[PDB]
Amino acid sequence: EFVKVRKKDLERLTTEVMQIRDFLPRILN
Amino acid sequence: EFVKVRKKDLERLTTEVMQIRDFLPRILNG
Amino acid sequence: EFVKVRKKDLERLTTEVMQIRDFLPRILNG
């Protein structure tokens, strides 16, 4: 099965994930 | 614009997001 | 081992996690 997903929603989610990915190192150190 | 995503990939993504979500009590409880 | 984290950083982290969590309906609804 395939689901249509808005490209801009995946891009916004990617940005949010990237933001957490770059924030956690600061917390860990 | 829409991207055609495999339902199994969205199911994996959902599960990964839920695992992060359900880490919050452990992180916040001290 | 424990890391001393600023409460404001955990609050930011929590909010970031919740934003990702609350994206799931939009991603899954088609």
Add this chain to the structure above:
Amino acid sequence: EFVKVRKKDLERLTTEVMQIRDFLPRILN
């Protein structure tokens, strides 16, 4: 205020975040 957080919990969360960060590009393309 400071909160004590288990280092291994932040490391596990980092791993989970990194896994999503590397998975979303595959979905987006």
